[PDB]
């Protein structure tokens, strides 16, 4: 098969050097609106076509459509609302104006404001997140938004500084990379942790029916205790060098603030990976879900409502390392009792390292452990 | 699918207790013909339906058809000639007579002689074995046969004494066993050696797409150096107990003298396994072939000429244990050089044990080794 960008064509909303030049000369005659970091990232994903066919923030009819149907008005799958919020005090502009969107003191984007509209916060929250419980991070963030959403097209002037720009290839680059290597089918594997054997098992299992693997670590906010992103990248570089043939794998990052919308977000992740050029998308259990809100297989079941998605989700059956079979196996072929079975848990393996323990090599490749240990502190303190 | 016996129906040519009674009272009025042990085994396989639809030894038109087309006159696949040979001196009978076939001083079968015919030994040999080189065991055995072949139906009175009768279930028993366990698809795995990890890998790999596995050790002539058959059976019993879930495997023996006909014999083995009730038949490299006569994949390629065989051959791609991946892998997913790779060789593993060495556990399950070692001598001295 061939991977076509969501909506037919890859969006490019980067500003010409002529536009960025004049904007900053004439910036005092443009209303400024402050945005959060998550939004500045959304704006680079719009500009670089990661959110194709979006060309800016959603207008009213599109927002309502996304809430009610997870589709755009024209029926194209779209499941995560991409919106810009302002309060009454922050609203120093009107419909038709051109405004500048600032992150701190940096102008990130100019925006042609098409529509300024209101919304029901309780409907927003319940429909996106399937709950109106304030304990849910996303419901809490929805309830904190400004009263007004602002729809219209953007042009990217500046982007938030990225330490790993070298790894952050945009969709036009990953597509050309797939084509150079002769890959017609490509499987996306999304992660925010170092690779364990379970991860490798799935990726090499996909290698049997797909030409290549696109490992796509997400750069986002870090809880205290997570692996530093540098660590995830170096660990994966060690894995590929030592255990993968050379023309089977591509590693590039993408910046994206998780909304923890559960199954509604798995569709979004598939759309982003489609835009990168992928034909297939591995989906695991509890994907982008928050415990006690979404079922483990919920994020798999939702793809039944999107036959038209044109990227193939891949669901794998349960598996575990067996210490008597000495192999990754499954219940159908292994008769051994629970003490021989080791289920893979990125969290248990991380806590091991945090507690000063060595993961067995049926959990973690020796060389991957040595790479993690080569950092004086591989974990975020903030 | 459902497994139907070759030709539609399972042959039973066992003699009634009334026939065996009178035959031995009136034996002095029946010509006796001495047969080889291989032939007495052929006769039990005919009687118990292992050779369905055969009901005795082939007549002239059928023999010619099998040589030229590997099919019976009615076009049914049949590839190995099942014939009874006598010399001029041994021929104490005529067409229409009823004769007794003796192995030593034991009457094994009575036979209604339909046809006594001649044949060209050089054609026989070249067509069955693809060579007329006397160095080929089968060509040498063909050249030693009596000048006359004898066609006609048999009835089994006595069979060669079998130490493992308890394991030698006939096709009517294995079919009923499959049905009792609810297996609709069954895969045959044929062997004459103890199980190594490669064997287990294939059998459990088949378990993913088939309901059960039918491991079918062949009892036949033993070269000096082979494992005793008792050892193969106990080793497999240890393997299943320790590494297989309980309702996935069935182990029964069959007695059969290999003709070393290469690909022509792989079709015969599939027909025998079909008659046992199997739907699928694993075929490995150099199956029933003699080195420097048949290609490694020759025995796979021949099934292209038998679409109508109604038992599905299974061909597996190359694989090997990797001592850095620590797993059975393949070239597509493993980049490591030749010193990390261990290809499975039942012969190399046997020579290890003969030379007093311990096979690594990536070659042989600890418990399987301990079972073999539990015999004071696990190898045949003659
Ligand atoms: Zn096990
Ligand atoms: Zn390897």
Q: Which of B249, B263, B235 shows the shortest CA–CA distance to B366?
A: B235
Distance CA(B340)–CA(B324), nearest Å, equals: 6
CB A189 within 8 A of CB A203: yes
Q: Other C-beta atoms within 10 Å of B382: how many? A: 5
CB B227 within 8 A of CB B350: yes
SS3 state of residue B108 = strand
Omega of the bond prior to A292 within 30 degrees of 0, cis?
A: no
Q: How far apart are the first and last CA of chain B?
A: 44
Contact at CB, A245 and B328, closer than 8 angstroms: no
CB B245 within 8 A of CB A332: yes
| A337 CB within 8 Å of a chain B CB | no
Nearest CB partner across the interface for B243, out of A207, A245, A325: A325
Phi, psi of B21 (to 5 degrees): -60, -55
Contact at CB, B332 and A244, closer than 8 angstroms: no
Q: Which of B127, B189, B115, B197 shows the shortest CA–CA distance to B153?
A: B115
Contact at CB, B245 and A325, closer than 8 angstroms: no
Mutate to test the interface with B, among A198, A239, A326 (most CBs of B within 10 A): A326
SS3 state of residue B44 = helix
| A246 CB within 8 Å of a chain B CB | yes
Q: Which of A245, A229, A240, A224 shows the shortest CA–CA distance to A354?
A: A224
Q: Is the dihedral of CA B57, B61, B63, B65 positive or negative?
A: negative
Q: Name residue A150's beta-bridge partners.
A: A84, A116
> Residue B307: CB partners within 8 Å, gap ≥ 6?
none
Q: Which of A73, A74, A76, A39 shows the shortest CA–CA distance to A57?
A: A39
A22 exposed, middle or buried (CB, 10 Å; 0-12, 13-18, 19+)? exposed
Structure tokens given for B81: 């000639």
Q: Is the dihedral of CA A183, A192, B330, A330 positive or negative?
A: negative
Q: Could you tell me the strand order of the sheet in which A341-342 lies?
A: A327-329, A320-322, A341-342
Contact at CB, B332 and A245, closer than 8 angstroms: yes
> Residue A185: CB partners within 8 Å, gap ≥ 6?
A1, A209, A210, A211, A212, A279, A280
Domains, in order of start, for chain B: 17-156 (3.10.400.10), 165-380 (3.40.50.620)
CA distance A255 to chain B (A): 29
Place of tokens 């990052």: A253
Distance CA(B145)–CA(B63), nearest Å, equals: 15
Q: Is the dihedral of CA B333, B339, B340, B346 positive or negative?
A: positive
CB A316 within 8 A of CB A202: yes
Residue A325 sits at the vertex; the CA angle it makes with A323 and A326, to the nearest 5 degrees, is 55
Resolution (A): 2.0
Distance CA(B373)–CA(B229), nearest Å, equals: 14
CB A138 within 8 A of CB A125: yes
> Residue B236: CB partners within 8 Å, gap ≥ 6?
B194, B195, B215, B217, B251
A344: left (phi over 0), alpha (psi -120 to 50) or beta: beta
Residues of B forming the active site: 192-193
Omega of the bond prior to A209 within 30 degrees of 0, cis?
A: no
H or E stretch at A20: helix A17-25
For chain A, after which residues does the C atom lie more than 2.5 Å from the next written residue's N, i.e. where is it broken? Answer: none
Half-sphere exposure of A17 (CA within 13 A, CB side): 0
Helix-helix angle B366-373:B229-243, to 10 degrees? 150
Q: Name residue A249's beta-bridge partners.
A: A213
The H helix count followed by the E strand count for chain B is: 12, 15
Residues of A forming the active site: 192-193
Q: Other C-beta atoms within 10 Å of B184: how many? A: 13
Q: How far apart are the first and last CA of chain A?
A: 44
Distance CA(A112)–CA(B74), nearest Å, equals: 82
Phi, psi of B353 (to 5 degrees): -65, -40
A/B interface, count of CB pairs below 8 Å: 45
Distance CA(A371)–CA(A380), nearest Å, equals: 16
H or E stretch at A43: helix A37-47
Return the DSSP state at B27.
G
* Strand pairing report for B280-282 and B312-314: parallel
Distance CA(A25)–CA(A100), nearest Å, equals: 13
Give the alpha-carbon dihedral of A357, A362, A363, A367, to 10 degrees.
80
Structure tokens given for A133: 């419980």
**Residues B120-125: contacts with CB under 8 Å, at least 24 apart:** B121/B145, B123/B67, B124/B67, B124/B81
Experimental method: X-ray
Nearest CB partner across the interface for B204, out of A242, A245, A333: A333
* Strand pairing report for B327-329 and A148-156: unpaired
Distance CA(A284)–CA(B188), nearest Å, equals: 35
Place of tokens 């290597």: A181
CB B375 within 8 A of CB B231: yes
CA distance A325 to chain B (A): 7
Phi, psi of A158 (to 5 degrees): -135, 155
Q: Which of A327, A268, A343 shows the shortest CA–CA distance to A302?
A: A268
CA distance A320 to chain B (A): 14
């Amino acid at each position: 098969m061939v991977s076509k960008p969501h909506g037919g064509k890859l969006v490019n909303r980067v500003a010409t050097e002529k536009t960025k030049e004049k904007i900053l000369e004439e910036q005092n005659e443009f209303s400024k609106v402050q945005i959060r970091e998550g939004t500045a990232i959304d704006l680079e994903n719009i500009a670089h076509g990661v959110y194709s066919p979006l060309t800016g923030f959603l207008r009213k009819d599109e927002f309502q459509s996304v809430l009610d149907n997870m589709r755009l008005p024209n029926e194209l799958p779209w499941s995560i609302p991409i919106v810009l919020d302002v309060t009454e005090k922050e609203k120093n502009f009107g419909e038709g104006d051109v405004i500048l969107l600032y992150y701190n003191d940096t102008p990130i984007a100019k925006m042609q404001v098409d529509e300024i509209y209101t919304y029901d916060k309780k409907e927003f929250a319940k429909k996106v997140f399937k709950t109106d419980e304030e304990a849910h991070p996303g419901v809490a963030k929805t309830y904190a938004l400004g009263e007004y959403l602002v729809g219209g097209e953007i042009e990217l002037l500046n982007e938030v500084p990225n330490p790993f720009k070298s790894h952050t290839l945009r969709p036009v680059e990953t597509r050309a990379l797939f084509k150079e290597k002769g890959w017609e089918t490509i499987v996306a594997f999304q992660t925010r942790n170092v690779p364990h054997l379970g991860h490798e098992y799935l990726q090499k299992l996909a290698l049997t029916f797909v030409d290549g693997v696109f490992v796509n670590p997400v750069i986002g906010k870090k809880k205290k205790g997570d692996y530093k992103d540098e660590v995830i990248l170096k660990a994966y570089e060690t894995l590929f060098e030592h255990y993968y043939p050379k023309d089977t794998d591509i590693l590039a990052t993408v910046r994206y603030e998780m909304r923890y919308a559960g199954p509604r977000e798995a569709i979004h992740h598939a759309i982003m990976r489609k835009n990168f050029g992928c034909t297939h998308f591995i989906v695991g259990r509890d994907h982008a879900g928050v415990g006690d809100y979404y079922g483990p297989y919920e994020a798999q079941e939702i793809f039944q409502n999107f036959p038209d998605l044109e990227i193939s989700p891949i669901f794998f059956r349960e598996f575990y390392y067996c210490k008597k079979c000495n192999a990754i196996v499954h219940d159908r072929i292994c008769p051994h009792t629970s003490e021989y079975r080791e289920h893979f848990s990125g969290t248990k393996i991380r806590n091991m390292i945090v507690n000063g323990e060595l993961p067995p090599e049926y959990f973690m490749r020796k060389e991957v452990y040595e790479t993690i240990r080569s950092f004086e502190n591989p974990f975020v303190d903030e």
